[PDB]
Symmetry: C4
Subunit: 23 residues, 4 copies
């Protein structure tokens, strides 16, 4: 499922960027 693939990549990137902004 392409939608699931995109959402997974987006969530992983989202958590990383949020951690980097909090740091």
């Amino acid at each position: 499922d392409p939608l699931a693939v995109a959402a997974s990549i987006i969530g992983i990137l989202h958590l990383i960027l949020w951690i980097l902004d909090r740091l």
Copy 2:
């Protein structure tokens, strides 16, 4: 699955909106 579909859309929108708010 409607729940997976809605959650994927919402995660994509959540990343978009969060980034725009941080900018």
Copy 3:
């Protein structure tokens, strides 16, 4: 899949809670 189900519910909830916190 209970993990996917819980993650979908939780992602919806996370967007709700973040929008309300920023507002």
Copy 4:
């Protein structure tokens, strides 16, 4: 799907970390 599983775990962790940060 390992990608979906990793992203689900990541989403649960993200809500946990974000809630702890807001509190």
